[PDB]
């Protein structure tokens, strides 16, 4: 036991400007020898955690000055000075002062940047897909900012909203944009029966929706 | 260094008994104690033991049961959905911080089914982007390449979703117009599960 909660749960922040995240305990941190065993890791995604920094303050091997720890007793802070794309993923914070060792629930940061328009891609159904029965109408919206996007689905100008799915994608380390593809699905009859096959994206850089289609 | 070496999925129908090893290197194994952490994809990070004098964590107390010696095993017992999650291996001594790669275990009565891969092509632009449809595979844990890895710079991986029972996902790389068709591209989709590997060459 002893709950560790962090603070905030999601930090959006631009390149270049200070972070701060919180983590606070339901318990004194401080051993009866006198050390905090209080630690931060920082877990990218499809990664195991990685240790940033141990007992409050002290860096491992590797971790830059950017990165500072603070506090005592119940109340501690992670700093990050100059936010760099690099640095995005889930900041965990640690105790094992007390037996079992209880980790906290994470800090997404997430970094602020300037508005992207996605760039839409619409592609019909291949033939080896067609030939097992199945169409699979797809759709990519990529390199947008902010994660807020609206699709939809008009099959000659009547919209579907059966049978399709959609994945996002975490922000891109690379230039901080989202992505998502949206996928409709239909038999190889229902498709042949149709001639447009439209996505539209609502998007706040636009006050027009971003279309795209190909015909039958 | 310390390395950590941790199979990389496990599949088992529930109810039965599972038993993960981590084979450490790089140290002498015999100065640092194993920890063991499980995360279920919502976040969440738990700690379950450590070890052959084993210290537990009494929530974890009937499920896991430390082994060693090279080699640290970790076998968890009567597994339930709820038993899926990705499990660690770790020296988390101060200074000394290593992590396996960790091992994810899907317990399911679920039978393994290889993807199928259809080629996503489409016309106009200064780069022109393609993508591959990876869909009905079981368990997750795929893996899309394209030219062998070597094409990384535009590559937008999206996340599986379970569509009808099977998992369903897509892969897209953008290359300048110039080179395509004019160059092909494929993708390489890889589902260790099932030992499937299958190549897409992109044509239009
Ligand atoms: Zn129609």
């Known amino acids: 036991d002893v709950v560790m909660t962090q603070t905030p749960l999601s930090l959006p922040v631009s390149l270049g400007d200070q972070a701060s995240i919180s983590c606070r305990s339901s318990?004194?941190?401080?051993?009866?020898?006198?050390?905090?065993?209080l630690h931060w890791y920082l877990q990218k995604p499809g990664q195991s955690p990685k240790l940033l920094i141990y007992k409050v303050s002290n860096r491992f091997s590797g971790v830059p000055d950017r990165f500072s720890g603070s506090g005592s007793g119940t109340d501690f802070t992670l700093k990050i000075s100059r936010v760099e794309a690099e640095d995005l993923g889930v900041y965990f914070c640690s105790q094992s002062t007390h037996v079992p060792r209880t980790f906290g629930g994470g800090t997404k940061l997430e970094i602020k940047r300037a508005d992207a328009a996605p760039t839409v891609s619409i592609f019909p159904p291949s033939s080896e897909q067609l030939t097992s029965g199945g169409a699979s109408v797809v759709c990519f919206l990529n390199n947008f900012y902010p994660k807020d996007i609206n699709v939809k689905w008009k099959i000659d100008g009547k919209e579907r909203q059966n049978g399709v799915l959609n994945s996002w994608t975490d922000q891109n380390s690379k230039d901080s944009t989202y992505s998502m593809s949206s996928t409709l699905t239909l038999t190889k009859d229902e498709y042949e029966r149709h001639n447009s096959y439209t996505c539209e994206a609502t998007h706040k850089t636009s006050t027009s929706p971003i279309v795209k289609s190909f015909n039958r | 260094q310390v390395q950590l070496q941790q199979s990389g999925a496990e599949l088992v129908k529930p109810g039965a008994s599972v038993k993960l090893s981590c084979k450490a290197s790089?140290?002498?194994?015999?100065?640092?104690?194993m920890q063991w952490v499980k995360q279920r994809p919502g976040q969440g990070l738990e700690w379950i033991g450590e070890i052959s004098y084993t210290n537990y964590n009494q929530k974890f107390k009937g499920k896991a049961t430390l082994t060693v010696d090279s080699t640290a095993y970790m076998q968890l017992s009567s597994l339930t959905s709820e038993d899926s999650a990705v499990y660690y291996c770790?020296?988390?001594?101060?200074?000394?911080?290593?992590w396996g790669q960790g091992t994810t275990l899907t317990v399911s009565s679920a039978k393994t089914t290889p993807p199928s891969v259809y080629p996503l092509a489409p016309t106009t632009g200064s780069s022109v982007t393609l993508g591959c449809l990876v869909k009905g595979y079981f368990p997750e844990s795929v893996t899309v390449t394209w030219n062998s890895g070597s094409l990384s710079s535009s590559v937008h991986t999206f996340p599986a979703l379970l569509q009808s029972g099977l998992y369903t996902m897509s892969s897209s790389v953008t290359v300048p117009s110039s080179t395509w068709p004019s160059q092909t591209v494929t993708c390489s989709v890889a589902h260790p599960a099932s030992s499937t590997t299958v190549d897409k060459k992109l044509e239009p």
């Open positions: 790089g140290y002498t194994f015999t100065s640092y104690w």
């Open positions: 318990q004194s941190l401080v051993h009866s020898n006198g050390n905090t065993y």
């Open positions: 770790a020296n988390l001594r101060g200074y000394f911080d290593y």
